Amino acid sequence: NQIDLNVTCRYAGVFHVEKNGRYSISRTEAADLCQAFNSTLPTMDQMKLALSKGFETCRYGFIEGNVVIPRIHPNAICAANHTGVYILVTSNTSHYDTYCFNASAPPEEDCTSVTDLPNSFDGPVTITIVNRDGTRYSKKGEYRTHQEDI
Ligand SMILES: COC(=O)[C@@H]1[C@H](C)CCCN1S(C)(=O)=O
């Protein structure tokens, strides 16, 4: 009973979370997951400021109201070579990664590692935060409040 959460640097408090190395998060789960990091889904304005500070990924993830990819450099296989916050328009499917926003993070680029999951609740899952540099933090708990996401 394990969940791996790969996380990135924070940029103006915004970061990317990928679960179990695949697109596997629903919109309801995404809000619960950010809540476990004392965070919320980013607004489009928060994501645009994060982008301006250096944030880019090559993965679709939820923000408030849309599923997006922040892009700085044009890459043919990342959001069809687009730059800026690329918004997903047409998809058959519902599960993606998520972005999260922590208001207490530093204002610009923070590439220190994440060492805690501060607001998870009691439960039976071994949740492991995996940083880009390989460092890990694990704790027994749960963050999903909707039965259909479990
Ligand atoms: C340092 O910035 C943070 O608040 C991060 C993260 C953005 C949310 C979750 C807790 N942490 S932490 C103390 O690294 O584990």
UniProtKB/Swiss-Prot annotation:
The chain holds residues 23 to 171 of 778 of the full protein. Interacts with PKN2. Interacts with TIAM1 and TIAM2. Interacts with HA, as well as other glycosaminoglycans, collagen, laminin, and fibronectin via its N-terminal segment. Interacts with UNC119. Interacts with PDPN (via extracellular domain); this interaction is required for PDPN-mediated directional migration and regulation of lamellipodia extension/stabilization during cell spreading and migration. Interacts with RDX, EZR and MSN (via FERM domain). Interacts with EGFR. Interacts with CD74; this complex is essential for the MIF-induced signaling cascade that results in B cell survival. It comes from the Eukaryota. Expressed in the intestinal epithelium. Glycans are attached at residues 6, 38, 81, 92, 102. The gene is Cd44. N-glycosylated. O-glycosylated; contains chondroitin sulfate glycans which can be more or less sulfated. This is CD44 antigen. Residues 13-102 form the Link domain. It comes from Mus musculus (Mouse). Cell-surface receptor that plays a role in cell-cell interactions, cell adhesion and migration, helping them to sense and respond to changes in the tissue microenvironment. Participates thereby in a wide variety of cellular functions including the activation, recirculation and homing of T-lymphocytes, hematopoiesis, inflammation and response to bacterial infection. Disulfide bonds join 9-111, 34-100, 58-78.
